[PDB]
Amino acid sequence: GMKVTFLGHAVVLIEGKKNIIIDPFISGNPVCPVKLEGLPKIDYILVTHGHGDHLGDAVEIAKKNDATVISNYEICHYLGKKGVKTHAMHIGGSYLFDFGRVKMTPAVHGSGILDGDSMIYGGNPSGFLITIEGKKIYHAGDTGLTREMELLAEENVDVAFLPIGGNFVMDVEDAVRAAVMIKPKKVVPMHYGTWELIFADVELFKKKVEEKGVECVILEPGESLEL
Amino acid sequence: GMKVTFLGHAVVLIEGKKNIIIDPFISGNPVCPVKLEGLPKIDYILVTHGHGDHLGDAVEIAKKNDATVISNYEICHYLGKKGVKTHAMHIGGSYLFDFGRVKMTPAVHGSGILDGDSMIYGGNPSGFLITIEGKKIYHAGDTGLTREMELLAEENVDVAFLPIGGNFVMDVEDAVRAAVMIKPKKVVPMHYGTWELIFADVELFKKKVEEKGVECVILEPGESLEL
Amino acid sequence: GMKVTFLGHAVVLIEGKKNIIIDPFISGNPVCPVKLEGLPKIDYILVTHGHGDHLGDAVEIAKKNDATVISNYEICHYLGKKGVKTHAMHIGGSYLFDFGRVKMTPAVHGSGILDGDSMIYGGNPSGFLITIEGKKIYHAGDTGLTREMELLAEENVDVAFLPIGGNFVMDVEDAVRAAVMIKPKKVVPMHYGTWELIFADVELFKKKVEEKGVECVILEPGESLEL
Ligand SMILES: [Mn+2]
Ligand SMILES: [Mn+2]
Ligand SMILES: [Mn+2]
Ligand code: NI
Ligand code: NI
Ligand code: NI
């Protein structure tokens, strides 16, 4: 019986036997209700791609917790040079960790790491399919609509986190199409409202996806559900 | 009632209330019928990926026009350091500009930026779906055949620009398959003939795609259609 | 009547009128039964992506043979600076060489080139569809499961090499799904066992894919089949 908390933008914290955080953009995240000090003990950090609003505080959280960062090969190379413990994977690959299974899923996006004024290659972007005690969480990362999402329908995902903010990621209309492709038991919208460029009508998303038969739960930053 | 002009290779100029150019490879483009001075006022420049035969003269055109370059996050970072005004997006994302909507579409290709002798990471490659006054133009950028194109069928695209030159991009046979996937009202072949490596039998493309029920319009560089 | 030899990890050697090697990771490859000196004359080297366990000894093999390396634009740029003869292509593109046709196929993965301590951008990762005297070989490169593989079903591939090692690439279960998508006449598992991280139950793969109606041939490193 784990606690899954949305912390704003794309930050998702999973508290169970082990504690896992995805795309830990805490410092400088204007809708994040906690500071780094407010986080619990962290065991794993999952990073979907290199962009700073996802990579976030991964280095500091990992070092302060002796946590392992799970990401693609190229991002882990970058982090390794920062003195961070990593477990590299790549797109479509999966591994069984002490807490459960992680699979990196395809995304259509980019994965540059901005280090000073230099854009470093951070592999290709992903999402994560996480299986813990028979329960499945999908975090799509940053992505546009892609037919690769149809590969997830047979998984019978319990909770799918989908970006709806538009411009850099799917807007509301395409995220509805994604929800229909994936057919999760519940969908949670994310990556909206953080800046005005990614404003989204989240109430309209909930209304439209529920009309297609998929339950939607709107989590404000700091709110949680149990799996 | 806009004027859409093919200027050779992958260069497409849209003249309406605002003027938009896609992949503005003008200087050094051996099939381009105009020089930079021959271009009209430009409001927007769309860049599908980092390769020089698409990025082209984007920097000079933007600075001489105070134009905005629309491209992915990584390419816009590169251009920003060149003093260019940008509006960053990423794959599958869309935004409503003063002239109409632009959506970046998935492509399967690469996006290196050659800066001197260094290959800079330019994100992931895209195409563009452009909606202006209810009319839709698809420019596929450089790409191979991908099932992501099937996402465009429901758009009822008016004009689709598809590469047919082979080697770096789809050849004639795969571009026919793409046309069948997308089902646009009209298809225009591009990215062929510019160099001998990308020779294509464009008359055979027209013949084969029309046998599948899709009207093909062959535009020589400098020729145009109205939308 | 060509000889196709699996040399371990992802190394595939095709001996015919011309000799072709794919992802020539020889030196430092712990399951490779030959040393560089043990290779025959090489005419072409195909590199699916930038990762060192695939790029491998491409530079030394090419220079010692005056061989041409076929890969994406970005990888060929890197190799060109190493003094290597290249023929650049990109994803979905094809070209007819003196020995037959090569087409680069989509993969979902990454393509960083590790040069010293720097990660260089090596384009996007691919596989190869090779057509020689009417016979077709698919080498998927490193990849996760992707619907782009369904584009290959109509090719009636004779032999498909698929990664099954998990973590960085498809595991056994997803590779079975891939085999069903592609429907080749025979499948050969690869990219497993080389390190403990990519252990795979290869006998289980053979059993499961044959239950789906696809013949599987397990080649130990050094074993071959004729096409
Ligand atoms: Mn983001
Ligand atoms: Mn091009
Ligand atoms: Mn590999
Ligand atoms: Ni992003
Ligand atoms: Ni290109
Ligand atoms: Ni790899």
Q: In a 10 Å sphere around its CB, with 0-12 CB exposed, 13-18 middle and 19+ buried, how is residue C188 labelled?
A: buried
Cα–Cα distance, A86 to B35 (Å, whole number): 52
Cα–Cα distance, A198 to A166 (Å, whole number): 6
Nearest-neighbour CA in chain C from B99: distance (Å): 33
Element housing C190 (H / E): strand C186-190
Cα–Cα distance, A157 to A86 (Å, whole number): 26
Q: What is the CATH number of the domain that holds A63?
A: 3.60.15.10
Interface test with B, best of C87, C115, C121 (most B CBs within 10 A): C121
Alpha helices in chain A (DSSP H): 52-55, 58-65, 73-80, 172-182, 202-211
Residues contacting C154, CB < 8 A, separation 6+: none
Which residues between 5 and 24 in chain B have a beta carbon less than 8 angstroms from any beta carbon of chain A? Answer: none
Say whether B36 sits in a helix, a strand or coil: helix
What is the experimental resolution, given in Å to one decimal place? Answer: 1.9
How many CB atoms are located within 10 Å of the residue B125 CB? 30
C171:A94 CB<8 A: yes
A110:B104 CB<8 A: no
Cα–Cα distance, C191 to C164 (Å, whole number): 6
- Tell me which method was used to determine the 3D structure: X-ray
How many CB pairs (< 8 A) connect A and C?
A: 74
Domain with C78 in it: 1-227
Give the DSSP letter of residue A148.
G
Residues contacting A51, CB < 8 A, separation 6+: A110, A111, A112, A113, A114, A142, B73
Nearest-neighbour CA in chain C from B26: distance (Å): 21
- Domains held by chain A: number: 1
Residues contacting A212, CB < 8 A, separation 6+: A176, A179, A180
Cα–Cα distance, B208 to B144 (Å, whole number): 18
Contact C140/C163 with Cβ under 8 angstroms?
yes
Q: Does C119 touch chain A (CB under 8 A)?
A: yes
B95:A51 CB<8 A: no
Q: CA A75 → CA A49, A82, B50, B123, C112, distances in Å?
A: 8, 11, 21, 14, 10
Cα–Cα distance, B132 to A112 (Å, whole number): 31
Nearest-neighbour CA in chain A from B32: distance (Å): 31
Say whether A155 sits in a helix, a strand or coil: helix
Q: CA B144 → CA A44, B120, B219, distances in Å?
A: 37, 22, 21
Q: Which residues pair with A13 in a beta bridge?
A: A5, A21
Say how many Å lie between the first and final Cα of chain C, rounded.
5
Q: What is the B5 CA–ligand 2 centroid distance (Å)?
A: 18
For tokens 């998927």, the residue is C140
Closest chain A CA to residue C169: A93
Cα–Cα distance, B11 to B8 (Å, whole number): 6
Tell me phi and psi for residue C199, to 5 degrees. Answer: -60, 145
Q: What is the A163 CA–ligand 1 centroid distance (Å)?
A: 9
- Which residues have their alpha-adjacent CB atom under 5 A from ion ligand 4? A 51, 142
Closest chain B CA to residue C121: B121
Give the DSSP letter of residue A197.
G
> What is the number of helices (H) and of strands (E) in chain A?
5, 16
Task: Please tell me which chains touch B, using 3 or more CB pairs under 8 Å as the contact test.
Answer: A, C
Buried b (16+ CB within 10 A) or exposed e, C94-113: bbebebbebbbbbbbbbbbb
Q: Does C79 touch chain B (CB under 8 A)?
A: no
Nearest-neighbour CA in chain C from A81: distance (Å): 9
How many CB atoms are located within 10 Å of the residue C224 CB? 16
Cα–Cα distance, A90 to A84 (Å, whole number): 18
Q: Which residues pair with C69 in a beta bridge?
A: C45, C86
Q: Does C147 touch chain A (CB under 8 A)?
A: yes
Cα–Cα distance, C60 to C82 (Å, whole number): 10
CB-CB: which of C108, C112, C117 is closest to A121?
A: C112
